[PDB]
Amino acid sequence: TTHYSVVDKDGNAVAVTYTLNTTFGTGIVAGESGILLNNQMDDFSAKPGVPNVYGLVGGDANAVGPNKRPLSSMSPTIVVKDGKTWLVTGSPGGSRIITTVLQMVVNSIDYGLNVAEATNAPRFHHQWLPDELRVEKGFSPDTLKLLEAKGQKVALKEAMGSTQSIMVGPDGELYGASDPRSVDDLTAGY
Template sequence: SVLAPNGDAVSATSTVNAYFGAMLRSPSTGIILNNGMDDFSVENATNRFGVHWSPSNLVAPGKRPMSSMCPAIVLDADGKVKIVYGGAGGTRITSAAALILFRNLYLKESIKQAIDGLRLHHQLFPNEIYYEKGFPRVLLDSLRDIGHREKEEVEHSSFQGIVRLPDGTVAANMDHRKRGSVEGF
C-alpha cells in the first residue's frame, strides 16, 4: 500500500499462492514460480483452505481462477483517498478486510487498533467460525449458543494499511502477525 504526498494511491497484491509457490525456482532468474492454478476448483474436491469445488471455477481456456485478494483504496465524500490497504492469507483475506474497515470506519479505531485487533473468520464452508487466541470467551459462547461451531485459528491473514486522518496527517500500520514495517518520507 502506498499513499503519495499529492494524494495518489496504490494498493497491489501479488502472490506465489502457497508457501514457496509451486516449490519450483527458475534456474535462469532464481524467481520462485507460483502455484496459482491451485486457485481453480478440482471437481468433487475441497482445496487446502476448506473451500468446496464450484463449477464456475473449473479450469477453462481464457479463465482466471477466483481469488480472495482484495487490495482496496477507500475514498471520502470529496473523492480524496482516506484508506489504502491490502493483505495476504488466502480465504481469510476477505473477512479480515471487512473487519478492519468496520473497526476503522464505524468503530473509529485507529488503523493500528483495527489491523492489530483479534479476528474472526467464517467462509460458509466448512460451517465453522475460526477465532484468534485471546478472543473474548463471552462472544464465542454467544455464537455457540446460536448454533455456530468454533475453532481456534492456526493460519492468520496479514494486513498493512494507511489512513489519512481528518487533520491531513497520515498513519500507517503493518500487521504484527507477519514480519514487516511501514515507511514514510
C-alpha cells in the same frame, strides 16, 4: 501472498496484493532465472464440490480451462471518506482475505478505531464450508460462550493475515500500521 500499500505526497494511492499462492509456490525455480514458480492453478476448482487448499469450492464458473484466470480472493481495497482516499488496505490469507479486509473496514467505520487499533484487534472468519466460526486468540471467554450458545461452532486456529494499511487524515497527514502477526515488516514514511 503478500499485501503492501503506498500513498505519495500528492495523495495518489496504490494497494497491491500479489502472490505465488502458497509459501514459495511450487518451490520450483525456472531454470537459471532464479525465479520461483507459482502454484496458482490450485485456485481453480479441480472438480465440482471438492475443496482446494483453502477449503474453497466451485463448479463451472471457476473450472480449469485454457488461458483462464483462476478465481482469487485477493482484495487490495481503498475506502473513500468525504470524497477523499481515506483507508488503503489489504492482506494475504487465501479465503480469509475477504473477512480480514472486511474487519479492517468495519473496525474503521463502525468502531472508529485508528488504523493501528483496527490492525491489532483480533479477527474471526466464517466461510460457509467448512461450517465453523474460526477465531484468533483474543476474544473474551464470555463472548465465546454466547456465540456457542447461539449455535456457532467456534474453532480457535492460527493467526489470520498480514494487513499493511495507511489511513489519510483530513489535513492530508498519513497514519500507518503493520500487522503484529508478521515479524520484520515495516510501515514508514517521511
